[PDB]
Amino acid sequence: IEDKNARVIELIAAYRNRGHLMADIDPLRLDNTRFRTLWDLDREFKRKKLRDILSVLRDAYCRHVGVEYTHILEPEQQRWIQERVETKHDKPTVAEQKYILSKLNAAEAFETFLQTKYVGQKRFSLEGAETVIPMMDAVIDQCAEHGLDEVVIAMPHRGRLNVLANIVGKPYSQIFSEFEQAHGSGDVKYHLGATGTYIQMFGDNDIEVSLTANPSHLEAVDPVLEGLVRAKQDLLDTGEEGSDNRFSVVPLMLHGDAAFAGQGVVAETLNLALLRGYRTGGTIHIVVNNQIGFTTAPTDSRSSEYCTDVAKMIGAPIFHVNGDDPEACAWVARLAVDFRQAFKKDVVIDMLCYRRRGANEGDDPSMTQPYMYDVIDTKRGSRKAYTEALIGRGDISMKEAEDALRDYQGQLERVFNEVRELEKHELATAVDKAMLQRIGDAHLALPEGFTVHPRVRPVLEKRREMAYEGRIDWAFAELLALGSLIAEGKLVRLSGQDTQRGTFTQRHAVIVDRKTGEEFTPLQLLATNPDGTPTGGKFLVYNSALSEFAAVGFEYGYSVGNPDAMVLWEAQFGDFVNGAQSIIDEFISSGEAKWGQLSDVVLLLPHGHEGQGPDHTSGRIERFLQLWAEGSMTIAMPSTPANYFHLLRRHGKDGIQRPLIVFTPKSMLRNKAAVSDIRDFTESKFRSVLEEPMYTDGEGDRNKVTRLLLTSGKIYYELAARKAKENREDVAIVRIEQLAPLPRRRLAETLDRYPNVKEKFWVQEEPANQGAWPSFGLTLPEILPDHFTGLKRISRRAMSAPSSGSSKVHAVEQQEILDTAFG
Amino acid sequence: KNARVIELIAAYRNRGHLMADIDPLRLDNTRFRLTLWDLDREFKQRKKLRDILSVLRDAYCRHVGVEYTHILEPEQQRWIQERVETKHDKPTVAEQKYILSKLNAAEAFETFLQTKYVGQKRFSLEGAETVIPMMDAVIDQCAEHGLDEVVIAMPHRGRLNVLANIVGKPYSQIFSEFEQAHGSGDVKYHLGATGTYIQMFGDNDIEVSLTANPSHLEAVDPVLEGLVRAKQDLLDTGEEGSDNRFSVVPLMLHGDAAFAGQGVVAETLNLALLRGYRTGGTIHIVVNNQIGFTTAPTDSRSSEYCTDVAKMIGAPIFHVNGDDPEACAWVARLAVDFRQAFKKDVVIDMLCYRRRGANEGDDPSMTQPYMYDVIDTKRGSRKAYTEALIGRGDISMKEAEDALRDYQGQLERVFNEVRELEKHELATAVDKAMLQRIGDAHLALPEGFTVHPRVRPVLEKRREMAYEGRIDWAFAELLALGSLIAEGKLVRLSGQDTQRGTFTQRHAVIVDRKTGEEFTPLQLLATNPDGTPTGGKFLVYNSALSEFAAVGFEYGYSVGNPDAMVLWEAQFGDFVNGAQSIIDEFISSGEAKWGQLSDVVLLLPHGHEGQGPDHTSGRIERFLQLWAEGSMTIAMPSTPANYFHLLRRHGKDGIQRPLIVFTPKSMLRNKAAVSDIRDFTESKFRSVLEEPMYTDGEGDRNKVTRLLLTSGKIYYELAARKAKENREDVAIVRIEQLAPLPRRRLAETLDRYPNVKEKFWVQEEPANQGAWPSFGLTLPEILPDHFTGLKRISRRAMSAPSSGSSKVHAVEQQEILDTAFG
Numbered sequence A: 001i002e003d004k005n006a007r008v009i010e011l012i013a014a015y016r017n018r019g020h021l022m023a024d025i026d027p028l029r030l031d032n033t034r035f036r037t038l039w040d041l042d043r044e045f046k047r048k049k050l051r052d053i054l055s056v057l058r059d060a061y062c063r064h065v066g067v068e069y070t071h072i073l074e075p076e077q078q079r080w081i082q083e084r085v086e087t088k089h090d091k092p093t094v095a096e097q098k099y100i101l102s103k104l105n106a107a108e109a110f111e112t113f114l115q116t117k118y119v120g121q122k123r124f125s126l127e128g129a130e131t132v133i134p135m136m137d138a139v140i141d142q143c144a145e146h147g148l149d150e151v152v153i154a155m156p157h158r159g160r161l162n163v164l165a166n167i168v169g170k171p172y173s174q175i176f177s178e179f180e181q182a183h184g185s186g187d188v189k190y191h192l193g194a195t196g197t198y199i200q201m202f203g204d205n206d207i208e209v210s211l212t213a214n215p216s217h218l219e220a221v222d223p224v225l226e227g228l229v230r231a232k233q234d235l236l237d238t239g240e241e242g243s244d245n246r247f248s249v250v251p252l253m254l255h256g257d258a259a260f261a262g263q264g265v266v267a268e269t270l271n272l273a274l275l276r277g278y279r280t281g282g283t284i285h286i287v288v289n290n291q292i293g294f295t296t297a298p299t300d301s302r303s304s305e306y307c308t309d310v311a312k313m314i315g316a317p318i319f320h321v322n323g324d325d326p327e328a329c330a331w332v333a334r335l336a337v338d339f340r341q342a343f344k345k346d347v348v349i350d351m352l353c354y355r356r357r358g359a360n361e362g363d364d365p366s367m368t369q370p371y372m373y374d375v376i377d378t379k380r381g382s383r384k385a386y387t388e389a390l391i392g393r394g395d396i397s398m399k400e401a402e403d404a405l406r407d408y409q410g411q412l413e414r415v416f417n418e419v420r421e422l423e424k425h426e427l428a429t430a431v432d433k434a435m436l437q438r439i440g441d442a443h444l445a446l447p448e449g450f451t452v453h454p455r456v457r458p459v460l461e462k463r464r465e466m467a468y469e470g471r472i473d474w475a476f477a478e479l480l481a482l483g484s485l486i487a488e489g490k491l492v493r494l495s496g497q498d499t500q501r502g503t504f505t506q507r508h509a510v511i512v513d514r515k516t517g518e519e520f521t522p523l524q525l526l527a528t529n530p531d532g533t534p535t536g537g538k539f540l541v542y543n544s545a546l547s548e549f550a551a552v553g554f555e556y557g558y559s560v561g562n563p564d565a566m567v568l569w570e571a572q573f574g575d576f577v578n579g580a581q582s583i584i585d586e587f588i589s590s591g592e593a594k595w596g597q598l599s600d601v602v603l604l605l606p607h608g609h610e611g612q613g614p615d616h617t618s619g620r621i622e623r624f625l626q627l628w629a630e631g632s633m634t635i636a637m638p639s640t641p642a643n644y645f646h647l648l649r650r651h652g653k654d655g656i657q658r659p660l661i662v663f664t665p666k667s668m669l670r671n672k673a674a675v676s677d678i679r680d681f682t683e684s685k686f687r688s689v690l691e692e693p694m695y696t697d698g699e700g701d702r703n704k705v706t707r708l709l710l711t712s713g714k715i716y717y718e719l720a721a722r723k724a725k726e727n728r729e730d731v732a733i734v735r736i737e738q739l740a741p742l743p744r745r746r747l748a749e750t751l752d753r754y755p756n757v758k759e760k761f762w763v764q765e766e767p768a769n770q771g772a773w774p775s776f777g778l779t780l781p782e783i784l785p786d787h788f789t790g791l792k793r794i795s796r797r798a799m800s801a802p803s804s805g806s807s808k809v810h811a812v813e814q815q816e817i818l819d820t821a822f823g
Numbered sequence B: 001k002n003a004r005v006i007e008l009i010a011a012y013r014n015r016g017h018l019m020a021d022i023d024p025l026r027l028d029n030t031r032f033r034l035t036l037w038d039l040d041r042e043f044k045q046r047k048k049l050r051d052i053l054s055v056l057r058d059a060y061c062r063h064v065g066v067e068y069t070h071i072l073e074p075e076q077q078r079w080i081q082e083r084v085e086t087k088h089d090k091p092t093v094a095e096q097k098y099i100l101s102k103l104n105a106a107e108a109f110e111t112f113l114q115t116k117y118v119g120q121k122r123f124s125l126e127g128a129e130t131v132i133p134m135m136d137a138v139i140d141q142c143a144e145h146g147l148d149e150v151v152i153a154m155p156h157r158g159r160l161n162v163l164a165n166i167v168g169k170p171y172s173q174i175f176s177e178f179e180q181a182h183g184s185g186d187v188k189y190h191l192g193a194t195g196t197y198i199q200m201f202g203d204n205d206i207e208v209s210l211t212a213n214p215s216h217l218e219a220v221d222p223v224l225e226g227l228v229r230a231k232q233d234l235l236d237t238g239e240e241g242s243d244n245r246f247s248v249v250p251l252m253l254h255g256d257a258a259f260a261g262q263g264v265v266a267e268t269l270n271l272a273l274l275r276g277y278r279t280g281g282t283i284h285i286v287v288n289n290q291i292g293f294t295t296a297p298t299d300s301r302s303s304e305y306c307t308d309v310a311k312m313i314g315a316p317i318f319h320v321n322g323d324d325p326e327a328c329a330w331v332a333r334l335a336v337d338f339r340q341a342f343k344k345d346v347v348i349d350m351l352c353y354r355r356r357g358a359n360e361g362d363d364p365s366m367t368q369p370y371m372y373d374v375i376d377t378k379r380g381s382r383k384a385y386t387e388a389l390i391g392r393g394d395i396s397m398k399e400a401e402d403a404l405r406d407y408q409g410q411l412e413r414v415f416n417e418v419r420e421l422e423k424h425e426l427a428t429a430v431d432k433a434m435l436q437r438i439g440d441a442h443l444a445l446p447e448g449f450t451v452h453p454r455v456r457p458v459l460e461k462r463r464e465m466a467y468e469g470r471i472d473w474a475f476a477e478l479l480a481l482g483s484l485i486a487e488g489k490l491v492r493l494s495g496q497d498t499q500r501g502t503f504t505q506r507h508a509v510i511v512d513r514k515t516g517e518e519f520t521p522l523q524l525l526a527t528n529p530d531g532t533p534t535g536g537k538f539l540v541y542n543s544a545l546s547e548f549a550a551v552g553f554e555y556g557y558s559v560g561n562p563d564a565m566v567l568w569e570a571q572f573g574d575f576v577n578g579a580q581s582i583i584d585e586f587i588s589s590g591e592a593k594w595g596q597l598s599d600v601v602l603l604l605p606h607g608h609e610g611q612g613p614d615h616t617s618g619r620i621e622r623f624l625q626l627w628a629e630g631s632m633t634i635a636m637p638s639t640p641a642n643y644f645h646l647l648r649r650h651g652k653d654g655i656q657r658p659l660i661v662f663t664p665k666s667m668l669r670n671k672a673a674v675s676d677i678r679d680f681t682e683s684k685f686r687s688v689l690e691e692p693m694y695t696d697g698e699g700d701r702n703k704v705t706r707l708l709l710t711s712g713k714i715y716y717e718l719a720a721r722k723a724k725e726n727r728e729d730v731a732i733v734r735i736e737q738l739a740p741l742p743r744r745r746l747a748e749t750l751d752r753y754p755n756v757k758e759k760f761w762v763q764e765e766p767a768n769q770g771a772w773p774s775f776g777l778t779l780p781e782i783l784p785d786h787f788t789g790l791k792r793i794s795r796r797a798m799s800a801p802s803s804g805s806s807k808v809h810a811v812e813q814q815e816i817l818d819t820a821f822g
């Protein structure tokens, strides 16, 4: 009947849409509520019997795999999943089953060794979650089967050393070398990066496997992994910026259930997944879902059914899999890789498991989760269970079962023995005029039929004029630096919020056709020599998403992935970079000292007191200076276009991997005094300390100076204009262009040229507790006591905010600084 | 045939929104691009296919795109389905005229603002004015449900319009001393406000408020939630209340690019149904003008809609055409009804356009030439809706002309009113019985309650400490909070694993070994011995794994209820940098910027113990750098009793100021770090502490030639070394209150050591960290006769808070102790 056939259609849709709500995914079965005509079952429907349709639906959607995919908007993706999930799956070969068991044996023997040999390692234990090892193995093996080049992993602490041994393939001698509290991070080896080669067992392919470094800040590494992968993909000419659509470098990202639901950086990183500036062709996510977060239950950790519900944001398919079924876990891992290869989109695997040990050393987890731990106490391991089931199903003989147990024992013996044996042993930046002229000419070498917006056309003509006649402004000097690096063969990646045009309408790195909307990148012409051959260089410029945390994390990641790239991230205003504070604190400022991991990332932070309020005034110079330690970063605030040009060229050509923090201008972009001569680009270098041009080039007399004003940034021009207005020959203004490391020798040598100075003042726009004064006021009299003893401060008064909220108050305070400096 | 119909119905319900006419600009030209005899056949409840298809097209493919089949609760899917799939009778002309009056009021405000003042184009609501009759419908529907208050959080776009036409603030207050291509134009764009909404066609009124915010888009989102939650707790409504009304409604506005890119959005959505954070569902309005400064949506997000993040918590989503203010008002009322029925978030994606540019003097056709050639052909929302009402025969020409008179009068009124405005232009000690009561409370277990065998000694020890002394840090904290509850104060404590405590020291909540039932010993102190309530309460929760949203929430909670004691605890101080935007933009600076006060406490476990650079520092140097006179109190107590007095002073001083506490980890179990009963019953907070051998023992201060100034747990190590070597020539002085510096108490303490020849600031932290960067510069300036020649003893300056090796940590710690006694 038509009514009966309709009930079947509704039944099929119910299993496809909501079957996952009844699938037997929890190996602990904590929730019992979850589970709570006969003649029609043998009737054929449109041609299969109802019982056979219902058996296929129960096997596919209500067994050990919960499939969520009907939320996906692309019908072809829903169809692809449906077809692969709704078929009579042939059980794996005994060889495949034995191989999964061997990986479970290796994982368990590793955990047993680690928890028996050392005392304080329980909090990092993978016990109850060992099925993640044959699962990761299946991901990597499937990537090798597709002929891909590398799998890059990011993960937290749980099972880290097991992943090093059984996935990366690192030897025990390297893993437990100089191996080391009830809480906190263990050995530094729980944080370091690693590289290895994975060799297929039943295939003839190999693939590179790497693991990126990370802090204890859960999920903070997520955008770093994406950036590192994208840099590697651009190097291999694969993916978005490549010749092929393979995206042959795969991000494999591990997570914990509580961190995946609560950390905002997860959503920000998922949001990058299909962006032209940030896509990596889909990430394979594995959530180690042990249904606990330290002592916190999932009902206090999230407001949704699953810890993975955030991934619905980008229409990713989600697979909830029972961690006690390593075959279903391996099968889902392979399906995930196939989906990622077919659609270049993220796949999330929610592996339901348990945490056998506590949240900290000496923890009795039944104190806060008595019910969960009374169930965990009855649980046998996933290895013993999978071995028991294979004999139960008659898949392996009793002899084969004992050999598997002696493989376990041999694996345990080997790591004890190997660690026992280990314990027994224990450049010029100036360019030629022709280079400047070429970059100028590039702004007018428009494609045939291209229509420039009438307001952009004068910018291009003025850049040709500047290249040939001088008075080069800040925005053009930046493009002269990047353009000349591209001409020399360097990859330049520039990104940030509205960075193609520039927040202050100054950059125009990308220009838009007035009639078609087609994008044109003038600096990209520098990637080709006049002979028509490539330089090897490239200009990659993007408008970022409205993120700071993920975007800064990505760019840091990108510089790690390709140390030969020039990577710049620009804040809309330096004031918004505090949204990426975790990246600044945990990776950029400290990654080198903590993990030996190097980055040459540039942060461009528009900075300056101009009356636009406390969120459009400061990049927090004082915070970056406080983070600095010898050799960790370079911190600068250039006052001239040419000095900024030389700063960027020195950074890209010095052969050193060190982050550069630049406090960049806003109104000073259009200050007509803030322009440079051609000779400043062709016959000079970066100057960490600058004197007034009247003393280095003019008829100024340094011996008339009794008051020395030390400063940095745009306030120089205001100080210099007041000096000229009042003909103050008794006053000299010295700029500190490089704030960190302090240019001690150049500063001492410059000050020695003013012998009649009776008083020295550090002049700054920022409040007394901000800017360079908190560090300079303490460091300058200590590093140079014969020069800075008695150094006094001229600044805004100390404030709890970077500035006043009133532009009227700003103007009064600015004038007060100028009147004090010349009082 | 019947099967094809079932599939057709599901296709409209699930994907009809992909074909709905939601974009007023119709930028995507590919968006729109079994038999006719079956159309007249009745299907199964018995309706013709033509009728089923008309209802489905009207409900899902007109000016409203409905997303709801992702919702796992079947009763919620059914509720939406039933209200959306009905033959909707067109509104009454009076209702249409009311919607027009709100568009009249919205456009007259924008015309005035963009004509009277220069530099206002980047904040313009032009192209998005339909958000005003939409917000009006939200608030009017909340008043119709008899609710108490609507609290709004929004960015700059249409902020003053909302002040005038939603909050009801007069023009004289909005434009008072009203003050440039970029940034924030006026402080009025950031300030909080409060008003009363009076219904037009009803007899209800409702309070309407707007919370303060920085320019950091979406950062205010968790702050709004905390604020509303505190107001709900005060009204005894919602989760911690007698009724399930949740009578205070969060109304949260957003921009399309910020809603998709900011992680704090997901973190705040994640709080929506949590017992410690739920507010009964938030009404979200996304002002989706399909642009983010100069950035197109394809570079801003990886999903079809800017609102796709809201699917995380199964919120229903309504995409509505901003050129249809009737559909916009209808969806707003439906959203309020859903929120009231299910106590869950509702998201309204209002598709509109941004008439002006991203900054003053911007020509947005430079970067979006196609969008702006379409915007240039667009007539305003008010003129379009007026023209539509004329064509549909809903209003006569006289009625349309009277609507234009109403518009013209509203525009004249603002100009005139602003023209007229321009013409005029405590003891913290408790009694022994209080300590004994808090001790006894730990053993006053409910009938049949089974204590975990490892928790029972903690309870018994607490009874012992209360009566015999040697009170440890963890108990001293509960003595402070418990005594405040006994005095009638609401105490809210939360953070990651805060019920048990990260270091298994707190046990604020204990769990029944057999049933899992929670017991809160301090909640017994909310009742007097005679049985009457004190008016106090203990609200303690395990937070989600968030820092940004959790810190934002607690800050907002203290703003919502200034009489509450609100404490947020970091698992380790090292993770608080994930909440840097809240520290920088609200906690440290809200008072100076907006006059907005908070008494929030941040508890940051801190100390060098060899657990690595992410389990060592709460970054004291960063909080000290943020501090300015009167903004915050910053402390690092060394004794349980001093921490007790610090919390009691904070809760009872009648001052709304954040308190930053650097709390211990191993020092929780240090047997020397214990206090006597008399320290709680006959003392007070001590900003400076001397060694007990000089204040209570036989020590001689005149023998001291070397003074060691320090803070925190390193004191005990310095004191133990002094004892071991009998170093009478050395004295150790602790600075318990780091900010504001206790200048007088410090000077008076140091005057008691006349023979001191050298002074050293001793700290565990690297030289560029801890208190030395600020103290090394401030102490010789504020007290030159005491600290000229002050020298530092510390770890060497580092780019990380510590070494990654516990072996390196131990060597460096011993080096500090040997230098201090060298």
Ligand SMILES: Cc1ncc(C[n+]2csc(CCOP(=O)(O)OP(=O)(O)O)c2C)c(N)n1
Binding pocket: A158, A216, A217, A218, A255, A256, A257, A258, A259, A260, A288, A290, A292, A293, A294, A355, B496, B545, B571, B575, B578
């Ligand atoms: C950003 C951040 N916040 C807090 C912590 C402290 N912390 C360490 S483990 C833990 C609970 C983690 O739960 P989950 O994500 O489910 O992982 P699991 O330990 O269960 O594998 C927390 C809150 C952290 N390391 N990082």
Ligand SMILES: Cc1ncc(C[n+]2csc(CCOP(=O)(O)OP(=O)(O)O)c2C)c(N)n1
Binding pocket: A497, A546, A572, A576, A579, B157, B215, B216, B217, B254, B255, B256, B257, B258, B259, B287, B289, B291, B292, B293, B354
């Ligand atoms: C956290 C943060 N990052 C960056 C900015 C700078 N910013 C100001 S407006 C803008 C674009 C906003 O787009 P959208 O959210 O769609 O709002 P709209 O201006 O279109 O209403 C940005 C990136 C900011 N204010 N806050």
Ligand SMILES: [Ca+2]
Binding pocket: A600, A650, A651, A652, A653, A654, A655, A656, A657, A658
């Ligand atoms: Ca370099």
Ligand SMILES: [Ca+2]
Binding pocket: B599, B649, B650, B651, B652, B653, B654, B655, B656, B657
């Ligand atoms: Ca207070």
Ligand SMILES: [Mg+2]
Binding pocket: A256, A257, A258, A288, A289, A290, A291, A292, A293, A294
């Ligand atoms: Mg977990």
Ligand SMILES: [Mg+2]
Binding pocket: B255, B256, B257, B287, B288, B289, B290, B291, B292, B293
């Ligand atoms: Mg927008």
